[model samples]
Target: MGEITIKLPDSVKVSTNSILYKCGAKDLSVTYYNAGDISLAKLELEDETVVASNVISGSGAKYAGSVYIWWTKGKTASLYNLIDNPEEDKPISCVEQ
Candidate 1:
């Protein structure tokens, strides 16, 4: 087969409301709105009755895009985008690795 299709998690939490989408490879990009104040944020990926648990950082005010690689043979992976406030984090756009 080609690149494995990663499954998205049930829900992803960010500063406000956010959406996570997969473009290519085992990469995931989360687009979210800061809404209120910006504080500490992170990208979390929970086990979906498949693998273990994992997490990543949202960088800083720059609002860096987080990335992850699907190590297992699973078809999909769940992802969550988290943030604080101040300015809307907006969204994260991830490309090929």
Candidate 2:
């Protein structure tokens, strides 16, 4: 299986409904609280069909684990990790490798 790493920028301050990430195949919506912390949301299709979801806190980097997704073939799982890439001054997008 392959893997993808999604990055959130330091400037991101999400509250209520927000678009966290977007790709050709999927987009992630972030549902946050008034206090400005990531709460929970889903990875949705272009038509707004939910495929995967997750819940995390402001301290996601320290507490969250990798999320796994099934490949189209369903023979393997791709791991998605939300991380802070050191090489970037402020990580703001996802990278697949």
Candidate 3:
């Protein structure tokens, strides 16, 4: 199978955007950036599933990265990333879990 690319919002925090994501098994990482403010951020996967829909941060270029993950099959999950700029928002980057 091939990788899929997801689109991000136009803001600075994860909570500001409401998009559900699904990552089966494999560990995962998510990131976003805002060129308007020159910022970037990242999130790490852990034991418990990451719920980014309610998480937010004020660091990195007015816009950066956010992470969300579901570490198992049929575990039920959704996710979205931070928006950094209104005109230059960047798509999220996902890595192998």
Question: What's the C-alpha lDDT at position 86 in model 2?
Answer: 33
**Candidate 2, 1-97: lDDT as tens digits:** 4533345566666455544444335444433233245433334433333334333424232212233221211221222433434332332343221
Q: In order, how many clashes per candidate?
A: 19, 0, 12
TM-score ranking, best first: 2, 1, 3
TM-score of every model?
A: 0.23, 0.25, 0.20
Report lDDT per candidate: 0.32, 0.35, 0.33
User: Global lDDT for candidate 2?
Assistant: 0.35
1-97 in candidate 3: lDDT tens per residue? 5432344556544322122333554454544333443333333445433323222333311222243222212223332333333333343332332
Instruction: Write the residue-wise lDDT of candidate 1 on 1-97 in tens digits.
Output: 9332333353443344333435344434333343233322234334221222222434323323343222211233323234332243433334322
Question: What's the true lDDT of residue 30 in model 3?
Answer: 41
Q: Model 1, which residues run further than 4 Å from truth?
A: 1-15, 27-35, 45-61, 64-97
